[PDB]
A paper describes a structure:
The mechanistic target of rapamycin complex 1 (mTORC1) integrates growth factor (GF) and nutrient signals to stimulate anabolic processes connected to cell growth and inhibit catabolic processes such as autophagy. Direct binding of RHEB–GTP to the mTOR kinase subunit of mTORC1 allosterically activates the kinase by inducing a large-scale conformational change. Despite the fact that the receptor–PI3K–AKT signalling pathway originates at the plasma membrane, RHEB signalling to mTORC1 occurs exclusively on the cytosolic face of lysosomes. mTORC1 is recruited to lysosomes by the RAS-related GTP-binding (RAG) GTPases RAGA–RAGD under amino acid-replete conditions. Here we reconstituted mTORC1 activation on membranes by RHEB, RAGs and Ragulator.
Using symmetry expansion and particle subtraction to remove RAPTOR–RAG–Ragulator, we performed 3D classification on the subpopulation that does not contain extra RAG–Ragulator copies and identified two distinct conformations of the mTOR–RHEB–MLST8 subcomplex. The final resolutions of the intermediate and fully active states were 3.61 Å and 3.16 Å, respectively. The M-HEAT domain of the active state moved closer to the N-HEAT domain than it did with the intermediate state, with an average distance of about 5 Å. The FAT and kinase domains of the fully active state moved about 5–7 Å towards RHEB compared with those in the intermediate state. The mTOR–RHEB interaction is largely maintained in both intermediate and fully active states; however, the residues Met1255 and Lys1256 of the FAT domain of mTOR are disordered in the intermediate state but engaged with RHEB in the active state. In the mTOR intermediate state, Tyr35 in the switch I region of RHEB flips to the opposite side and is disengaged from the nucleotide, whereas, in the mTOR fully active state, the switch I region of RHEB adopts the canonical conformation of the RHEB–GTP-bound state. The FAT domain of mTOR is more engaged with the C-lobe in the fully active state than in the intermediate state. The established electrostatic interactions between residues Glu1581 and Gln1355 in the FAT domain and between residues Arg1585 of the FAT domain and Glu2311 of the C-lobe in the fully active state indicate direct communication between the FAT domain and the kinase domain to promote the active state. In the fully active state, the ATP molecule was positioned 1.5 Å closer to the catalytic residues in the C-lobe than in the soluble mTORC1–RHEB structure, aligning more closely with other atypical serine–threonine kinases in the phosphatidylinositol-3-kinase-related kinase (PIKK) family in their active states. Finally, the mTOR–membrane-interacting site is only seen to dock in the fully active state (4), suggesting that this interaction is involved in finally reaching the highest level of activation.
Author numbering:
A (entry chain A): 851 to 922, 929 to 972
B (entry chain A): 1869 to 2429, 2490 to 2549
C (entry chain B): 8 to 324
D (entry chain A): 1254 to 1578
The structure:
Amino acid sequence: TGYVVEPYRKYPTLLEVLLNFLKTEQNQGTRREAIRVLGLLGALDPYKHKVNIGMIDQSRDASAVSLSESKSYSTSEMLVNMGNLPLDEFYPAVSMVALMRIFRDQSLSHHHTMVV
Amino acid sequence: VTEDLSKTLLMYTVPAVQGFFRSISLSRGNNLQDTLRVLTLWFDYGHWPDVNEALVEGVKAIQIDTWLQVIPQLIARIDTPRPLVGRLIHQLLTDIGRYHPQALIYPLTVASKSTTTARHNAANKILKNMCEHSNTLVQQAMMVSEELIRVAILWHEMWHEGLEEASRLYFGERNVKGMFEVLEPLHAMMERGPQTLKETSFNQAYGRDLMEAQEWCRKYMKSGNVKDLTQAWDLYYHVFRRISKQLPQLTSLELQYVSPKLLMCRDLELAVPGTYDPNQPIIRIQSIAPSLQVITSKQRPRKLTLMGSNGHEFVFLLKGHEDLRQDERVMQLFGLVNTLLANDPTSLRKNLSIQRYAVIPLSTNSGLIGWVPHCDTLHALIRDYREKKKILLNIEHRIMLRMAPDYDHLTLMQKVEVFEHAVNNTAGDDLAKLLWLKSPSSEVWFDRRTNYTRSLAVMSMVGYILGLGDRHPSNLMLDRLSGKILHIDFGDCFEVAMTREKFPEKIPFRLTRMLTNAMEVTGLDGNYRITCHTVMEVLREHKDSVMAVLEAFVYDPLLNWPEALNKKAIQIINRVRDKLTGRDFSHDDTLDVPTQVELLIKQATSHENLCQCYIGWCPFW
Amino acid sequence: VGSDPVILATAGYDHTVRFWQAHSGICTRTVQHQDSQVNALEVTPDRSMIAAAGYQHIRMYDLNSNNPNPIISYDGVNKNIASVGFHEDGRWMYTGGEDCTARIWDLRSRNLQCQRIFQVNAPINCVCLHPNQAELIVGDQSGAIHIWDLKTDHNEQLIPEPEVSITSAHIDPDASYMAAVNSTGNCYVWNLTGGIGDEVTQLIPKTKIPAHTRYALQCRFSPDSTLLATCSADQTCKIWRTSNFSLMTELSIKSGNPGESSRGWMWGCAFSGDSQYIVTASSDNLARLWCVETGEIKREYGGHQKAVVCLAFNDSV
Amino acid sequence: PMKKLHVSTINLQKAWGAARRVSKDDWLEWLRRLSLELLKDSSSPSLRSCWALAQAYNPMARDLFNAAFVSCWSELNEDQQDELIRSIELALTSQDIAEVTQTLLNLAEFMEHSDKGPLPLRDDNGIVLLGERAAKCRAYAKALHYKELEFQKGPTPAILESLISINNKLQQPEAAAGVLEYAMKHFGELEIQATWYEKLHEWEDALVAYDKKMDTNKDDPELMLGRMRCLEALGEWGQLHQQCCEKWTLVNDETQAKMARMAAAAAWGLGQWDSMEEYTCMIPRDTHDGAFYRAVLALHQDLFSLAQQCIDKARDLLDAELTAM
Ligand SMILES: Nc1ncnc2c1ncn2[C@@H]1O[C@H](COP(=O)(O)OP(=O)(O)NP(=O)(O)O)[C@@H](O)[C@H]1O
Ligand SMILES: [Mg+2]
Ligand SMILES: [Mg+2]
């Protein structure tokens, strides 16, 4: 169909999902197909990718009338948000974060025993 | 001569207006520059007939929502003497209210309470026109505005402020008539009577003493003897001590004590302040939280909360003692600068957008400030860093006191001695290590630091053009996600702090060593200086739009807080023109952007300029 | 303290003023100077009274009695006072302040306020007076050296370097050369004019002297009009020769170790009548007396708990 | 709570057994076993509870590798810590695999953030080692961080070289300009080399300098490579191909491998496909560049099947780099 580049904008999570596949799955064929899709969709400009996921927003930044925000993790991010408190409380925190990452995921139901 | 000049002006202006309206219609979103240019042409030549018909045709043809960009400027000339200009301003504002009342009600509410007669009656007329079709929204906005003003400063607050001012006046200035003038509004609100549980409690607690002081005042200007005045001062001192002891205990205000009306109203059709956008569904005030946190600062704002119609909380900081109109117009100018930086591809790629919040003034003394999430003041950031590292917060200051316990009392070069001793014996890398430590990964650290440096350069140059002073660490904030710098208080714009008698500021912007160390290790000669050059080029090329946005200060008394007022305003704008063009440092000479930026960086980095800064400015930081 | 023909005084941030003798090496007495620091010291020509200029007040100190308090604490200047200066008879004392006012008060009377005032656009750095006592060189923070006529109030102003802070100025007793020194580390020397009351007092500039790469603070001619001493903020003082403005004399207190830097500036200097011994103050708590010919530590005046700034030196046969 | 647990030291340094691990599969297995054994020997019961689930689900082991190492490391004494440092250094130095190197650098920066402090990896806290490892691992933000640590500890012209290189490979020409200005201010005495312009993306000046330096030294490897890089960047395919033809007959085979990439690019730009066939032979078949250029040659000769499995191999080889970056 030639529906290229646009899928990134209309599906901001598409590029993130495709890249995350490379981290998660191990099958070589699936990874090769993921790379094929990534190339076919185009090597998106990193600025355009940031715009798609909203990290950069000129609609609000350049808007004359400013708008209020609508509100009042990895192991490294967990440490950064947990560095104030000791390591003894960091270990259960990251343990529970990983355990819940697995546990919410229903596709790993066969691990939900051990997780609990 | 004059007639030929008028003919040339009209024949070069009417095509200008036509072309600008065509371009605005063809832009549809990226038209703030063109809208401001149209407003400048309309303000300077709208009264001319042909320009008037051209403007009427363009306004009729052009989409209304565009004008939402420039609501302040229009209201800044709502009271234009020229007949046709005022007529078209009023008609345009009426239309904007007819289709987009949400954006325009709040500025109109502010303008209604203007001391000026022309602005007052014009705002009243436009509010009546708004009411003619949206009486519900108009009265709702008025009610919530008045209630939030009431909550901004309690009867405690203004009585304490008035007593403080009277104490300075009678003992400092020996101005008893000034004391009476300052106190008359307080007696006026006493006559108004209590209207909320907090007001009734304050009445039952101190109103008898206040009326007794008023009685000795009556005796005073019925007889003219200072004995009655001192009798009044006795109870004034007693109530002042009582209120001063009570004030720290007001760490959190419950609405039903201070404003039950906010609790009565639910599921409102009014849009949340500073969230209306015609291209998106209108988020409305579903409810208001039952408790307002209060900060212990001198001005004592209130961390107010709203529950929006979309279910997401919207937090605001409610100020009662500052004029928020200046903050609003500075946010508008920051929006213009963001548009300019996005227009240029070179600066667009680099993400030089200025972080900004929503400012909603409610009167000439009170307003709401968008509470930016996930941000920390530079003072708070450094305080947390030094508490965590067991480093002592005021290490540089006490090093100065050790070298000179009378540090404020020295001559200039002796102050340079003390300041350089403090700087050279302290690492000054708190912000660099803190940006590194607050980053999940080196990728995020580098992104955050790039954004920090670029935003710091952008805001440095913009504030310099804006003459933004009082940039102490508590007035700077840093994002916990993007790393950009956010400037939050703009009560000293246009070099006001650079001319005050007490501790005048001698620097254009904050470029202390702690910031420069958080930059690239090679220093500010790279990312910072190049970004400053870029931003100065963008602003100097588009100085017309910056001046157009700043004309709001020319035709308003905002900078006063009357030909002297106009003289001062045109002097300030002349200074801003000198800054933009480059004739700031020497009037007889014009400087290219690299030279001007070098001079400004030297000025903001010079130890002679930094040492003279007031100590709480933390120049050593 | 007035017994010896040779006397010097020292002061700084320690809220005290100290007095020393040339060949003693130990403080004679310490007199409290609380409530403020001190910016300048000067012993009157007659050697009967010392003026200490600090913040918002000028204090007077006896020279012949035995450990008194301050005797006349002049007040009135709302902000920091920066300089002092006396007439030969000592009746009239000149001064300059940080509040853009250069003033001249009385000393041999009980007058509690100023006698003459003069306005200048910028705060006044160290001020000096022509030897004949009829003209005032006033150094402002804007770099504009002011020639002020005492008999006509004529205020000529010359700016040899735009937008810089001239720090000090001194004119030799012979009224031949005059020197000024600024924060750029430069010494500007101008020839005088042999006038008495002809209103000429023309100043003819000369070759610039790149004295320092760092803030230069105090430049003073010798009483014999033979040598000039310029002490700066790089912990260096250079003694230039008035004949040709050459130099073989360095006065440094650098430890030499990079880990022991920022030891302290040199804040002033004071030649002798013979002009072979020179005493300077150093913000590393200490005052040093050297000899120009050899440039070796002749004496060190220990005793100041905190840094030292200003010095005065008077000598007699 | 449940108190701590004894970190079995023997099995802990045994898990860091990079002595007889060579192939990529060996190193991935080493990383897996180490990440599991850290959880098994973790002092905190909270982490050790996750070991059973990690064993049957490796991504869990990958998630808690940093925290597991922190838990194991904080219990060891000075000597055991020193042994662990020596083995960590050996692991970083041994072989450059994107996955293992990425994990170890992530651990290094994690320890940098942690209150325990940076790992005393060498005399310089592994600043130089981690910096070069990040540089060649294609992870340039970490490389920038450690190079800036080097700069803070002391600035030298070589640190400025690497810092300009990193900043421009982060697409920061403005930061590179800043580093150049720092060099000119504090190192104006030295003559700025051609490599500076090459890394500053001042390709024209870099080429001018390389020509001015080559006339004094005929047939120098580094000079030749730099001149070719400048020519390729400038788009001067004709000059690049002339240089390739002129010098290909005397280049060392090891340096002929470096020649080959730019040679093939230039020949493609001109169209001497026999020359491309000659050059691409030297490019390894195990690199994405080699597979991609072999696919290009196959397509020019219209071997669509051959080009197809060549593109498949190119994707397979690029998978590791893409996953790491
Ligand atoms: N827009 C904002 N977003 C987030 N936090 C804010 C904002 N404005 C203020 N704050 C926070 O609230 C604190 C107090 O508000 P601030 O505006 O400093 O009041 P103030 O100290 O009375 N003003 P001033 O005397 O002009 O410095 C700040 O220091 C921040 O911590
Ligand atoms: Mg505050
Ligand atoms: Mg504030």
